Amino acid sequence: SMLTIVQEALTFDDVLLLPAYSTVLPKDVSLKTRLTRGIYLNIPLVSAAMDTVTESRMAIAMAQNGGIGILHKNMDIAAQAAEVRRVKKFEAGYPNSCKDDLGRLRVGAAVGTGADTPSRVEALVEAGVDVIVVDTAHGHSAGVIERVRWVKQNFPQVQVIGGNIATGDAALALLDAGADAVKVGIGPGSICTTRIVAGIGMPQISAIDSVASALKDQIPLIADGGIRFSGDMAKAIGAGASTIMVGSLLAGTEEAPGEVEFFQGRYYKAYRGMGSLGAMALVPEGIEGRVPYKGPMGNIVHQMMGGLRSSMGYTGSAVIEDLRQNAKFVKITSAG
Amino acid sequence: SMLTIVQEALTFDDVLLLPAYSTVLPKDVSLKTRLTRGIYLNIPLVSAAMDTVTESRMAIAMAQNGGIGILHKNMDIAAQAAEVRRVKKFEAGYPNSCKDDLGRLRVGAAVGTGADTPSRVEALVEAGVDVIVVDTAHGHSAGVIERVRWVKQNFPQVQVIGGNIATGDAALALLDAGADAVKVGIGPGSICTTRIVAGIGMPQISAIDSVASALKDQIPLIADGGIRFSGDMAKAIGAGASTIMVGSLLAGTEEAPGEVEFFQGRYYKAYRGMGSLGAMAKLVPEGIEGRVPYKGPMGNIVHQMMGGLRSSMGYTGSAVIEDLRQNAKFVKITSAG
Amino acid sequence: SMLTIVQEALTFDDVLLLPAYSTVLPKDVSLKTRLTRGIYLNIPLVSAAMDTVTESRMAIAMAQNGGIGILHKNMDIAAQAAEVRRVKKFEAGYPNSCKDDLGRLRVGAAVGTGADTPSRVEALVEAGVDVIVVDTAHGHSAGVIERVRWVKQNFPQVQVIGGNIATGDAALALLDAGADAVKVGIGPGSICTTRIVAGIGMPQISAIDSVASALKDQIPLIADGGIRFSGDMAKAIGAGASTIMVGSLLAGTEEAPGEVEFFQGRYYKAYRGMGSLGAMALVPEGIEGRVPYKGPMGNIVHQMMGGLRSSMGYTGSAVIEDLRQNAKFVKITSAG
Amino acid sequence: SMLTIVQEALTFDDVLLLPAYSTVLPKDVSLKTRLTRGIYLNIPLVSAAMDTVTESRMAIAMAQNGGIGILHKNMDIAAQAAEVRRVKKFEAGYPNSCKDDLGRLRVGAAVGTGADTPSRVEALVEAGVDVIVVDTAHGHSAGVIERVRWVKQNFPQVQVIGGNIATGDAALALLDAGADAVKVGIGPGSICTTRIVAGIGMPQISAIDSVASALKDQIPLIADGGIRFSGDMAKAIGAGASTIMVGSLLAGTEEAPGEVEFFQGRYYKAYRGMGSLGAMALVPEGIEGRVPYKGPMGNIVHQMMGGLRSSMGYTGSAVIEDLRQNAKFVKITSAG
Amino acid sequence: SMLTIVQEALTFDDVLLLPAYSTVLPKDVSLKTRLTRGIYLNIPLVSAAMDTVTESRMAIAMAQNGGIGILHKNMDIAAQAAEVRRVKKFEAGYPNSCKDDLGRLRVGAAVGTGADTPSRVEALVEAGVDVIVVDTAHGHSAGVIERVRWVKQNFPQVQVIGGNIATGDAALALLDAGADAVKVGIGPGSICTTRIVAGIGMPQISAIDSVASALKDQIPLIADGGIRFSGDMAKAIGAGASTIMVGSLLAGTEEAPGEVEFFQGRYYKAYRGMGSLGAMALVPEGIEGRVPYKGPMGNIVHQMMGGLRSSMGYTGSAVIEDLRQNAKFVKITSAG
Ligand SMILES: C[C@@H](Oc1ccc2ncc3c(c2c1)CCOC3)c1cncc(-c2nc(Cl)c[nH]2)c1
Ligand SMILES: C[C@@H](Oc1ccc2ncc3c(c2c1)CCOC3)c1cncc(-c2nc(Cl)c[nH]2)c1
Ligand SMILES: C[C@@H](Oc1ccc2ncc3c(c2c1)CCOC3)c1cncc(-c2nc(Cl)c[nH]2)c1
Ligand SMILES: C[C@@H](Oc1ccc2ncc3c(c2c1)CCOC3)c1cncc(-c2nc(Cl)c[nH]2)c1
Ligand SMILES: C[C@@H](Oc1ccc2ncc3c(c2c1)CCOC3)c1cncc(-c2nc(Cl)c[nH]2)c1
Ligand SMILES: O=c1[nH]cnc2c1ncn2[C@@H]1O[C@H](COP(=O)(O)O)[C@@H](O)[C@H]1O
Ligand SMILES: O=c1[nH]cnc2c1ncn2[C@@H]1O[C@H](COP(=O)(O)O)[C@@H](O)[C@H]1O
Ligand SMILES: O=c1[nH]cnc2c1ncn2[C@@H]1O[C@H](COP(=O)(O)O)[C@@H](O)[C@H]1O
Ligand SMILES: O=c1[nH]cnc2c1ncn2[C@@H]1O[C@H](COP(=O)(O)O)[C@@H](O)[C@H]1O
Ligand SMILES: O=c1[nH]cnc2c1ncn2[C@@H]1O[C@H](COP(=O)(O)O)[C@@H](O)[C@H]1O
């Protein structure tokens, strides 16, 4: 047989974490973790670089709650550089705030690889951005690898993240490029149609496992796409993630961009893939639609972290590294 | 690959018991078994320690029918001790009744690990409870292990169960602590959202097998949560269970707590996990609250449950519960079947 | 680990027959096969011993079309013996008719193991029944094995079948009892709830395989329960079956027992398990209900046999026995 | 124990392609490939030989877009031969046209094995057809193997395809018969009840692999049936196909045969299997019914080829053969 | 009692036309009628002065088919004057065309009562408009009366219409002002919410009779709004109308303004009242919505006039004026 089947790949619904001996209470566990090898967060949450999820308003909310938001790149360099500054300059009237050495809220910005990326990077770095995200659909490519190298070579004073990838090989490639972190996710996202359009994908749990196993903790990985519930977060971290990037979960919140729309007595906001027709206005690889209005994103964050605190209670994980190194899984069937 | 997959875990719908050579008729099989290493029931059914399932009215029905109820702890100590006493001195105007040495209907009572636990245990024992159920979400913990050891040390004249657990390891920890049985079930219950909130769980068939395998019959286990049909009970016992705890199947019956509410024709009672907002009214909820259809007297339900179980031991050639535990053969089925 | 899992058992929907090199067209295959080591049929179809499926009227249709029917036992001894004579003496004004040496339509009759069985067997044999079916829920029992032995010792001039079973061990036991065939099926039937009531069952393809492998063709097996389309018959036979018993597919035909009822514009007939509340009036192990009225069973038989001919075309099977010995399967997943 | 399970066969939904290192952009990949060992196409798309998909007008659109249509055979020899000419002589007032040495659009025609096949084949060859498709439900049969030899020996100047098949063995047989390509697909078609009627089938990824592996590139194979999305086409090619035949995706376009019917405010065309009752007027092996009207096929082709270029981008395949040789898959579960 | 109930008032569904002695066939009926006292049409159909119904393209189709369209006033003077010209300067490669003395396609245009109306009338008259429609919600107003007196006194070479109105008193006020016709209809429009918002309205049949009894044929009236079926045209004319104005029946046609949208496999266009939020950006007095795409307007126009012919055949009406003069009605209940 010539068919090369590399493994049976697993998503979130395929596995459960096993409870284990435990002395720590959910309320006492530590959620602190690494976004990059130089940036730490207080909760392992990143808002997605999407024009329906993260602009300055959301990014400020993320930082205030311990995480970080990745400003999207569907805007000209000036507007995006200005968004960075709104975050960097914001002043409150938040004990877990995520902050740089100068005590400013941390923020991040997506870039591409096209001909505007040198100017965009420069502007964002001068605006004080903490991490550049080279944010593409296929990170295991010569263009993303060399653009990651260029940012490290030419702006070594800022952290750089590359993606997206889904194999040990790609992760090893971006690591040698100089990346401070890789972002993991090809196919898992809620608004993704790559699986249908290109037949391309890697179940996220097996994806996380592949990248983490190859990286050997030299740099953190962000598990990006497909998180639907707090449980998914613990499975991801237990599979080896250091942080989790979420789009749908924060779409429709107060702080997300877009106007609340009234439709048949309910309240909605728009949520669309960056690869959707409307986003790009290359065959589309994403859908666009409405998600219910969710109110303040704070409630969502506290709920998701309560869930993860509960999980590290069952696993006996006093800090994030314990979940990463010690979780045990079982594989469940369709019935389960 | 750093991904530690311990096994493929099976729930109830993953397996079926094989029929085997048989000489015994469903009607002639014995359902007697042990709840703890010192307490025998006449049927292997235990009702759940939930404020929508077991108060004294339900515990008396359970005893009268050959099993036992575990009174829930969602009430102050005075109220729980009175519940024990109602069941313990209940007198009938029931040839299978489950009774202590003094001929009194048996009853159990749940406690937690909070600082009220010493007074609660003392009052429940003083009132004549037959078994203390140290009842938590995660029994493989120091608080529950040390609380199980403290009950055995300080009140050796009452039986103690620990849980909930789902691994051989946690069963050995509780066995070492003095437990007279363990309660198995992390995630399987009908009102359990723990799978979604924490990503935590162990399919119940594999859970039972893992616990039973480690214990080697030193103490029994109670299979708790996820029972939907009489067939589930046969599988549980075949996988190594000694008894079966149920909440959903007895919720909504006449004897379960709560009022019958009318609503668009049908009649209902409430049913909710002890991890629901409503029950706990801080940990985020780990269960749901809702209505279940009113079912009428619990006895009819128990009789159908045990009739189905009698059907199964007929098919398996099991004349007593222990035959089913030791001799059951399984097959794994797919999603199609 | 103490859990004894004997195998992953397969049902019809888990497997597909593989086409193979072929020289005989579907129109040219032979459907002839053996009910018992004594009785041959011209098609491998047996109608179910159910009070909504098989009384004399349907038993005659089965025989005329080359098969045979098993009259149910939910009637007194005199009524069942009269049903037998009705078939045995029927006269038409059917080239594939299934017939004994004297040219009479063949027929069969179900009995149990209760106190009445000696009388019942005796009346049936004197009425000319071709085969006795010791018809129980659990053939791997002392009662059924001994009753089968007693029918064979005391009425060696009629053929006897025992069931139902689902393992090699049980098939061996009935073989040594003197059974001239065994009937395979614990769980598969359309109206069965035993899997829900007792947690008991053998996926039918694996059941057939386990019985057929144990027997090594010493006696035929009847694959009883779970047949939904003609394709299932091809898999049962390829798995090892010599005949196929069906209830659901023939219920609601004109010849089946019962009246047609009018309901909301459709036309229905009753279909209920022999272990349902109504049929028995032991906790019930089957359901009661309606099935659409289907008209003359003759069209159903012809469509079923068409599909089996088509299947024997694809497999290069000129005779039933070629499908029995030569079928190759693939296992398939949920998606397919 | 006696059950022969050849393997767990996989369909499209069971597998995903893995992204790999990539230096080539979707817009720059080559879609060129072989239809037969002698005819090359510019895109790997073939329209199905069905009386609801391919007549001259659709066959011209296929060629015009770089592919080829196989005119169906549910018409007399005279009408079919004129359909060939209408394609061969069509002149436009299309830089990827697929053409023969004389610059004429290429076309194919389906024939059967029945008694008219000699007359039909001669008229088609005489009309200038580029490829004869011996088009049956069961290509692993003496009838089709002999008829494919008869076309090669008697009309060496035309290419011959034989099908349908699902195994290496059948592929090797047609190869020996002289086929210039094999058509793979037993049971995968959208309108196919063969799985239900005859219990016969091979999941298409495993079908392709089995055939591809046995042929060792001595002749291409055409993956025929079950294609629902462009993602499917990438999986088929990665599994080893050289082209893709589609019926459902092109049914309902303006160029497919048939009138547009208005029904309840929607616009439909008819789509039906060639084994359906309405087509044949043997038990039916397919259904008839409506498919939404889709407008001009060109948009569908473009959409489909764009998805495949995206896939070859993700996999680092610069030309079709790169995908065929270097594709890696993961198997995924029902949850996935 | 003090409540003043002028009458029980009838809409179209409250009445039926009685058949009468007839010596004429639908095919031989004449549909010619007057739009004003000076302009005649060949069919009694006027398209609605709405930004979702009538612009130049539709006004041309209206004229080509023997009717007239009124260009809406949701555009600056320059744009409306251009629209007129485009109609007045049209030529085709339509023997019932509606044409002025110069063989020009007739056309009409709507104006208001406020500031720009002097400049607007002038631009429109000088571009060759055949009729000016002083087009307001409430025509029984000093504003409308004097503006219609102004257009007559200052542009006696153009025909003028005033409306909308629903009573004889209102029609006499506009007759005395100089009107060449009046448009009748307060509340009957399909997108009208005036009945709900203001409580204001007049059932269209009774409005037509009230106005026609006052005018005594001195000028014709246009029955505007409420028309759903061709049968409503006959009743309107029978109750006294000389022409019918329609919005919704013509919206969604190819020739109407706006682009066709796709929404769940169906095709639509926009249709909205001129008193809806969108048209206006006063509390809105009309709704906004989609109507199904209807294809060419010619099919609708012809089917409509087909029905009207059928009616005049039933009624013995060889010309429009017989229907108007001789029609008898019965009142029917909710039952009928
Ligand atoms: C159409 C648009 O689609 C997106 C956009 C953003 C994405 N962001 C993240 C992910 C995916 C995305 C897909 C899909 C894979 O999973 C993660 C797109 C944009 N630019 C490049 C590609 C592409 N290049 C190769 Cl090569 C193949 N196609 C796709
Ligand atoms: C919110 C509430 O939820 C329940 C309540 C009762 C339960 N009873 C039985 C079971 C479960 C239960 C969950 C879930 C596991 O399966 C069995 C809860 C109450 N106190 C502790 C926990 C907890 N501690 C760790 Cl550590 C992690 N979370 C959860
Ligand atoms: C209630 C009634 O149920 C039926 C009836 C007919 C059946 N006929 C065929 C099959 C089954 C049937 C079950 C179930 C298994 O599949 C085949 C019944 C009747 N008498 C005996 C039993 C029985 N004895 C053991 Cl021991 C366990 N229960 C069950
Ligand atoms: C009824 C009709 O059904 C079709 C027609 C066209 C098909 N075209 C392609 C495919 C299939 C088709 C089935 C089914 C297998 O998948 C591919 C048919 C036509 N002639 C032969 C057969 C046949 N011969 C053997 Cl032997 C078994 N049955 C079936
Ligand atoms: C909001 C807008 O609404 C319309 C627009 C166009 C209409 N065209 C025709 C008809 C109606 C219309 C209503 C309603 C009456 O029936 C026919 C409007 C615009 N300017 C004036 C009025 C008005 N003035 C008085 Cl006084 C009372 N409200 C209403
Ligand atoms: O159009 C798109 N197609 C596919 N993936 C996308 C697209 N846009 C964004 N993504 C990914 O989807 C993620 C959000 O996934 P979600 O949290 O499951 O909704 C983002 O972080 C991106 O990695
Ligand atoms: O809120 C909750 N979350 C999870 N499990 C719960 C909760 N409350 C009770 N349980 C468990 O669920 C069991 C009842 O399961 P059931 O019989 O499937 O309804 C109880 O015996 C407990 O072990
Ligand atoms: O009540 C019942 N329970 C289980 N099996 C039954 C019952 N009644 C009949 N059967 C079996 O079910 C078969 C019919 O299955 P079906 O053809 O799938 O409808 C019969 O031949 C019996 O073997
Ligand atoms: O009636 C039929 N039964 C089974 N297969 C058929 C039938 N008619 C056509 N086919 C096959 O189905 C294919 C179309 O599959 P689709 O692209 O999934 O719609 C054709 O190319 C044929 O190979
Ligand atoms: O917003 C509005 N409110 C009320 N009536 C309107 C509105 N827009 C247009 N109309 C009237 O409704 C007529 C069209 O009615 P229809 O033919 O029933 O759709 C137009 O000729 C106007 O007289």
Instruction: State whether D310 and A198 contact (CB < 8 Å).
Output: yes
Instruction: State whether B166 and A332 contact (CB < 8 Å).
Output: no
Strand blocks (E) in chain B: 5-8, 15-17, 33-36, 39-41, 45-47, 68-71, 108-111, 131-135, 159-165, 181-184, 221-224, 243-246, 261-262, 267-272, 289-293, 330-332
Peptide bond into A164 cis (omega under 30): yes
D194 lines ligand 9 (CB under 6 A): yes
Calpha distance D67→C55 (Å, rounded): 61
Q: Which residues of D participate in the annotated binding site?
A: 135-137, 164, 185-187, 189-190, 192, 224-226, 245, 247-248, 271-275, 285
Calpha distance C54→C49 (Å, rounded): 6
Calpha distance A274→D238 (Å, rounded): 27
Q: Which chains touch A (3 or more CB pairs under 8 A)?
A: B, D
D206, D9 in Cβ contact below 8 A? Answer: yes
Alpha helices in chain D (DSSP H): 56-64, 77-89, 117-126, 142-154, 168-177, 194-197, 204-215, 230-239, 277-280, 297-315, 320-326
Residue among E227, E205, E233, E217 nearest E181 (CA): E217
Residue A39 carries which DSSP code? -
What is the number of other CB atoms lying within 10 angstroms of the CB of residue C134?
28
Residue among E274, E186, E172 nearest E225 (CA): E186
Ligand nearest to the CA of C316: 4
Q: How was this structure determined?
A: X-ray
Residue among B177, B73, B82 nearest B135 (CA): B73
Ligand 1, CB cutoff 6 Å, lining residues:
A 137-138, 164, 185-187, 189, 192, 194, 274-275, 282, 284-286; D 22, 26, 310, 313-314
Tell me whether D210 touches chain A (CB under 8 Å). Answer: yes
Structure tokens at A251: 């779409």
Nearest CA in chain A to D238: A3
Structure tokens at C87: 């078939």
User: Which of A136, A164, A183, A200 has the most D C-beta neighbours within 10 Å, making it the best mutation to test the interface with D?
Assistant: A200
C187 backbone φψ class: left, alpha, beta (φ>0; ψ -120 to 50): left
Breaks, C-N > 2.5 A, in chain C lie after 93, 281
Residue nearest to atom 3 of ligand 5 (CA): E275
- C98 tagged catalytic: no
3-state SS assignment for residue D78: helix
Q: Which ligand 4 atom sits nearest the alpha carbon of residue D188?
A: 16
With 0-12 / 13-18 / 19 or more C-beta atoms within 10 angstroms meaning exposed / middle / buried, residue E100 is middle
Helices (H) and strands (E) in chain C, counts: 11, 16
CA C61, C65, C69 angle in degrees (round to 5)?
Answer: 50
Residue among B88, B23, B101, B26 nearest B59 (CA): B88
Amino acid residing at A50: M
Which residues, listed in sequence order, are joined to residue C263 by a DSSP beta bridge?
Answer: C266
3-state SS assignment for residue C277: helix
Q: Which ligand 1 atom sits nearest the alpha carbon of residue D310?
A: 27
Residue among D17, D44, D12 nearest D220 (CA): D44
Nearest CA in chain A to D302: A283
Residue A165 carries which DSSP code? E
C247, C191 in Cβ contact below 8 A? Answer: yes
CB-CB: which of C19, C230, C335 is closest to D140?
C19
A271, A63 in Cβ contact below 8 A? Answer: no
How many residues in total does chain B contain? 337
Residue among B106, B50, B80 nearest B250 (CA): B50
Residue among E186, E183, E257, E191 nearest E215 (CA): E183
Instruction: State whether D21 and A282 contact (CB < 8 Å).
Output: no
Structure tokens at B63: 């005893």
CA C74, C80, C84 angle in degrees (round to 5)?
Answer: 135
Which chain D residues are within 8 Å of C7, Cβ to Cβ? none
Do at least 3 CB pairs under 8 Å connect E with D?
Answer: yes
Calpha distance B269→B263 (Å, rounded): 10
With 0-12 / 13-18 / 19 or more C-beta atoms within 10 angstroms meaning exposed / middle / buried, residue D196 is middle
C322, C33 in Cβ contact below 8 A? Answer: no
Calpha distance C307→E8 (Å, rounded): 71
Q: Over the range B117-127, which residues count as b (16 or more CB within 10 Å of their CB) and which as e? A: beebbebbbeb
Instruction: State whether B1 and A209 contact (CB < 8 Å).
Output: yes
Amino acid residing at E228: R
Task: Please state the φ and ψ torsions of residue C81, each to the nearest 5 degrees.
Answer: -60, -35
User: Which of C4, C183, C200, C235 has the most B C-beta neighbours within 10 Å, making it the best mutation to test the interface with B?
Assistant: C200
With 0-12 / 13-18 / 19 or more C-beta atoms within 10 angstroms meaning exposed / middle / buried, residue E267 is middle
Could you please report the per-residue DSSP string of D250-288?
TTTBTTSSS--EEETTEEEEEEE-TTSHHHH-----B-E
Residue among E98, E77, E96, E76 nearest E87 (CA): E98
3-state SS assignment for residue E190: coil
Residue nearest to atom 29 of ligand 5 (CA): E137
Q: Over the range A135-170, which residues count as b (16 or more CB within 10 Å of their CB) and which as e? A: bbbbbbbebbbebbbbbbeebeebbbbbbbbbbbbb
User: Which of E263, E264, E266 has the most D C-beta neighbours within 10 Å, making it the best mutation to test the interface with D?
Assistant: E266
B63, B86 in Cβ contact below 8 A? Answer: no
Breaks, C-N > 2.5 A, in chain B lie after 93, 281
Instruction: State whether D7 and C330 contact (CB < 8 Å).
Output: yes
Distance of CA B243 to the CA centre of its chain: 7
3-state SS assignment for residue B164: strand
Distances (CA, A) of A275 to A77, A136, A227, D307: 20, 10, 19, 13
3-state SS assignment for residue C115: coil
Do at least 3 CB pairs under 8 Å connect A with E?
Answer: no
| Torsion (CA) A280, A281, A282, A286 in degrees, nearest 10 | 50
What is the number of other CB atoms lying within 10 angstroms of the CB of residue A299?
12
Distances (CA, A) of D278 to D51, D209, D229, D269, D287: 11, 34, 27, 15, 9
Residue B19 carries which DSSP code? P
Calpha distance E265→B100 (Å, rounded): 72
C115, C133 in Cβ contact below 8 A? Answer: no
C209 CB contacts (<8 Å, ≥6 apart)? C239, C240, D1, D2, D3
Structure tokens at E295: 């294809």
Amino acid residing at D172: L
Resolution in A: 2.5
D243 CB contacts (<8 Å, ≥6 apart)? D33, D34, D35, D41, D44, D45, D46, D220, D222, D223
C235, C43 in Cβ contact below 8 A? Answer: no
Residue among B68, B67, B55 nearest B108 (CA): B68
Calpha distance C160→C108 (Å, rounded): 9
Residue among D242, D218, D245 nearest D164 (CA): D245
Structure tokens at D86: 């209408």
Which chain C residues are within 8 Å of B202, Cβ to Cβ? none
CA D264, D269, D271 angle in degrees (round to 5)?
Answer: 125
Mutate to test the pocket of ligand 2, among B134, B182, B194, B196 (most ligand atoms within 8 A of CB): B194
Tell me whether D266 touches chain E (CB under 8 Å). Answer: yes
Could you please report the per-residue DSSP string of C148-208?
HHHHHHH-TTSEEEEEEE-SHHHHHHHHHHT-SEEEE-SS-STTB-HHHHT-B---HHHHH
Calpha distance C273→C293 (Å, rounded): 18
Placement of tokens 């009908």 in the chain:
B190
| Torsion (CA) D190, D192, D195, D198 in degrees, nearest 10 | -170
Distances (CA, A) of D18 to A5, A325, D241, E209: 10, 26, 17, 77
A111, A135 in Cβ contact below 8 A? Answer: yes
